[PDB]
Amino acid sequence: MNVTTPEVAFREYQTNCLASYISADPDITPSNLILQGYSGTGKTYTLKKYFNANPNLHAVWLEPVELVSWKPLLQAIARTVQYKLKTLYPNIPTTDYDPLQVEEPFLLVKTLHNIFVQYESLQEKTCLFLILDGFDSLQDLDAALFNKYIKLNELLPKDSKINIKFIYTMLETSFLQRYSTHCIPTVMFPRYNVDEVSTILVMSRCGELMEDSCLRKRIIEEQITDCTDDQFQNVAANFIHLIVQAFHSYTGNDIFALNDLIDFKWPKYVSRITKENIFEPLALYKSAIKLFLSTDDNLSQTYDLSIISKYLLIASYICSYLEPRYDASIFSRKTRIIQGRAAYGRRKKKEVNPRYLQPSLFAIERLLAIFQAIFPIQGKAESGSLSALREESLMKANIEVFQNLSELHTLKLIATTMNKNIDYLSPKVRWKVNVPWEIIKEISESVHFNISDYFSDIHE
Amino acid sequence: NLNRHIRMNFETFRSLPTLKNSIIPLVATSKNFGSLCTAIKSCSFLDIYNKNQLSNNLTGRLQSLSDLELAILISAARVALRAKDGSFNFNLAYAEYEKMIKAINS
Amino acid sequence: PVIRKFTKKNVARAKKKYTPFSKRFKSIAAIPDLTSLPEFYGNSSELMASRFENKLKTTQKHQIVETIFSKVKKQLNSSYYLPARENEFASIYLSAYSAIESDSATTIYVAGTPGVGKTLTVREVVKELLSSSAQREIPDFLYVEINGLKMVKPTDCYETLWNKVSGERLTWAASMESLEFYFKRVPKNKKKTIVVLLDELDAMVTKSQDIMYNFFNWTTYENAKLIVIAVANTMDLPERQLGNKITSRIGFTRIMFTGYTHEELKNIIDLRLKGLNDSFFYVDTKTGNAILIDVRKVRLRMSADAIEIASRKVASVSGDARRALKVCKRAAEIAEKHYMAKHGYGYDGVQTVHITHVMKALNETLNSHVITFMTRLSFTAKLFIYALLNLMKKNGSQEQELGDIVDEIKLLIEVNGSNKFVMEIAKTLFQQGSDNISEQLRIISWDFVLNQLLDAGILFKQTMKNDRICCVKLNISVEEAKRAMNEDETLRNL
DNA sequence: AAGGGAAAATAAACAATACATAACAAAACATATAAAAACCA
Ligand SMILES: Nc1ncnc2c1ncn2[C@@H]1O[C@H](COP(=O)(O)OP(=O)(O)OP(O)(O)=S)[C@@H](O)[C@H]1O
Ligand SMILES: Nc1ncnc2c1ncn2[C@@H]1O[C@H](COP(=O)(O)OP(=O)(O)OP(O)(O)=S)[C@@H](O)[C@H]1O
Ligand SMILES: [Mg+2]
Ligand SMILES: [Mg+2]
Secondary structure (H helix, E strand, O other): OOOOOOOOOOOHHHHHHHHHHOOOOHHHOOOEEEEEEOOOOOOOHHHHHHHHOOOOOEEEEEOOOOOOOHHHHHHHHHHHHHHHHHHHOOOOOOOOOOHHHOOOHHHHHHHHHHHHHHHOOOOOOEEEEEEEEOHHHOOOOOOOOHHHHHHHOOOOOOOOOEEEEEEEEEOOOOOHHHHHHHOOOEEEEOOOOHHHHHHHHHHHHOOHHHHOHHHHHHHHHOOOOOOOHHHHHHHHHHHHHHHHHHHHHHHOOOOHHHHHHHHOOHHHHHOOOOHHHHOOHHHHHHOOHHHOOOOOOOOOOOOOOOHHHHHHHHHHHHHOOOOHHHHHHHHOOOOOOOOOOOOOOOOOOOOOOHHHOOOOOEOHHHHHHHHHHHOOOOOOOOOOHHHHOOOOOOOOOOHHHHHHHHHHHHOOOEEEOOOOOOOOOOOOOOEEEOOOHHHHHHHHHHOOOOOHHHHHOOOO | OHHHHHHHHHHHOOOHHHHHHHHHHHHHOOOOHHHHHHHHHHOHHHHHHHHHOOOOOOHHHHOOOOHHHHHHHHHHHHHHHHOOOOOOOHHHHHHHHHHHHHHHHO | OOOOOOOOOOOOOOOOEOOOHHHOOOOOOOOOOOOOOOOOOOOOOOOOOOHHHOOOOOOOOOOOOOOHHHHHHHHOOOOOOOOOOOOOHHHHHHHHHHHHHOOOOEEEEEEEOOOOOHHHHHHHHHHHHHHHHHOOOOOOEEEEEEEHHHOOOOOHHHHHHHHHHHOOOEOHHHHHHHHHHHHHOOOOOOOOEEEEEEEOOOOOOOOOOOOHHHHHHHHHOOOOOEEEEEEOOOOOHHHHHOOHHHHHHHOOEEEEEOOOOHHHHHHHHOHHHOOOOOEEEEEEOOOOOEEEOOEEEEEEEEOHHHHHHHHHHHHOOOOOHHHHHHHHHHHHHHHHHHHHHHHOOOOOOEEEEOHHHHHHHHHOOOOOOHHHHHOOOOHHHHHHHHHHHHHHHHOOOOOEEHHHHHHHHHHHHHHOOOOHHHHHHOHHHHOOOOOOOOOOOOOOOHHHHHHHHHHOOOEEEOOOOOOOOOEEEEOOOOHHHHHHHOOOHHHHHO
């Protein structure tokens, strides 16, 4: 045409289609265009690099992720279109329309109709590209909003001098397949290879890894001043090829997860270089082996709970994964004055391992029964017949057991069935724990309680 | 070859605006008349176009996965086949993952 | 000022007063004679309603051709003496003549299925007793059209009635207190009788039923001179909304209009053709313009059995006069376009409307198009329906899982691999024709034809984001889906 | 010490109830403007 195609690295098909649909002449440009790709696939990179290589065709860049609802999205369109045209044509006399006055999808059309008729003295047809960059990332999004922006071209005047053009950017391809019968052109941005991620990450980050002060400071301060830029570039490039080849299987074909694992592990990789480490790359990798094996993407006891709050999550974890039918066989200890048979226990093991499954609901009285079954002995016997009757060696539910059970519920460590204004004080309300096994195992080793023996006999 | 791409449209989409979006960058991305006369004889762009439109649908995303991402996707697909509701957890799909890596290394 | 939490920058408020009519004369004895008062009863409002005729006028007119069939379509319009509602005219006119002559108040309730002449004949009642009142055998009255579907809000009937009575623009909560003080407190010597037509009373009472009570309770008053002709659709709308003790207290008449018979449709259609049927026109042979009594003396008869079968078919279904006047208007333009195509007049021995023009006009409104639509879809779209119909005879569950449809489409190309059509299409339906595209999970244009059938209304799909366990109904029938797929050649053999 | 035999456990088909969420209603919270109503003056 009359347009310039930039050289984006691994997007050479996508840029030729992007130069095919976007042009200055409004007759040969579609009024809608989707650039679909997933995250990190380089579709705001080459969209930006296309418009920088073509300065005489005009663009309005909007991010629909920082606008959250449909109504600020309409208001930002009315604000940034007229603010673009004031910088773009200062010689045109205009009266500013309040962008906060649009409250409807039609009041946008009426406002854009009023903005565009006062630029009618222009010399030729001109298209302004309204780039909705991340339209699918709008939080309140529904199915009936994107086909409300497809059809704005038909409600705006056909012989205006300014023809607004929509360029959409979206992610998830189930949103895009809802609008397949509109037959509006789409350029797909597929995920990169492992070789395409590494080449992009090495041309994006070798500049910053030189101007980083940590590599800058050490080489003069270690008193090994025998290096050039071509070794400086090759020592940072070989780190990136080594930080990908270790952690590609963890991240995948991301760009933003690789960019975090570089700068979390580049200050730790610089501080292990000396004279034998710049020149030979294999020797430096064995001297920095402990930061290429573990990711460490994380930032006494896990909880500072009370000593009876700590046994009341344990009893919550028992009630919600052991079954109520087998509790008399496990916890009963006391001698029988009156004849009766104890519970026999589970006859055969289950191979489901219920701790994998979602926790089941229990009643409030079963929790308080298993609580005093497992709580340690309070008021220990002091070898006195005068003292042994009064002691009540087993713990009853005082005001603190219920206060700590209610505190354990406000901390979202015990759950209920979800109804708005549940009442604690009701027969129907049942309870369940929501902590994982890895938390209740850390809890049980603090109070020296062996919770694993209660679950070893069921399958493990 | 051009009448072959029309016949595929007639059997699958049967909509002329879908073929219309295919011809537009076959013409606009042609540098001279020697390449614009060639590109409608061969229609080698329309194979490249139809590959793009369908390059991250669900086959193109599965082919863009690493080895751990593929192993967890298989492991969650074996738990979802044994389950009666087709359902699984992260705990169930890591249990099937770790007994898979044991049986490979054994 | 203060920082506002949200803005309303498009509020447009009407200049309507707040104080009702009960607070502007300070005494019932100080109320003047309202009939000899200038702003009441619409004595100055006849200037602004006639303002908008000048907006749609333009001075260009270049000899539009008025052919033989254009005169018939002009005369079969619904806007253009009525034969088949005579006992219903004589019931509404008798009930309203007695209440106006006696300075009384009443309510007339009239219902029926749509299109049976009840908005027409109530306006013909009040036009007869306007002419009776203009001759001074009943006193003068004021007539108000209230249409429930010509209102934005249901409460706008209070505003529009009190505006027609008094010429005053008040809000609705001030208009019903203005009307209620008007009907029970103002004396009968100071008022004028008011005949209000509450047309389409269904639409006003859907949300709160506070509006049907007030108009009927105002007619029970002694001082009120109010005749509410309340035309609705169903006959039990008073007793469902108000109750049994309220509708017995009011004591209104209750008329139902039955839909017309086929012999009554013939005396409506042929009544609007008395000036044109069996009549002579002057048609010039170079422009096509007809003139009622280079030029032939052509004439025009319409077949009586054509009006017969247009009356037998319409009256057997609904019985409304609109569907019969526009099945004969539709037949009159089918006959025009063949007259317009034979001679080629365009726009600037004997003509007739046959039995085949009326049948063609009548068949196109009674046929369905879901047969003709689905026989001309893609192979892909017809393969989607054919896989869905196999699943509804393996189970009969009539809403199939969408992943069961995908595996059926793959199994149906699996098994029929010896077929001549399926060998050559399965390359162009999994790889889309050439190499370098991998073999894929969904057929090519699976998202296109699933959305094509949901947009058309053929197919219902529930809302699930798991694209595989989602369920899919039909919306047409299982019979007329199978009828469309046993016509296609390649699917019925496999 | 053996053993009977009733309590306890398991399983499976079926019925009855609870639960998560969709759809909505309504009250609290909020602003706007023309008409009334004080109110200086
Ligand atoms: N082909 C490429 N050549 C060079 N740098 C690239 C290329 N593709 C991506 N990048 C860089 O990698 C990062 C990718 O960011 P973006 O292009 O903004 O991703 P994206 O496609 O917009 O995905 P989302 O939806 O915004 S998370 C940026 O820092 C780009 O500069
Ligand atoms: N008996 C009749 N004689 C002549 N023309 C009639 C007759 N009945 C109906 N029409 C015509 O058909 C039109 C139908 O109007 P109506 O039937 O009065 O409206 P309607 O009964 O209120 O139906 P709605 O509004 O849906 S409840 C009239 O405007 C006339 O043109
Ligand atoms: Mg982006
Ligand atoms: Mg009517």
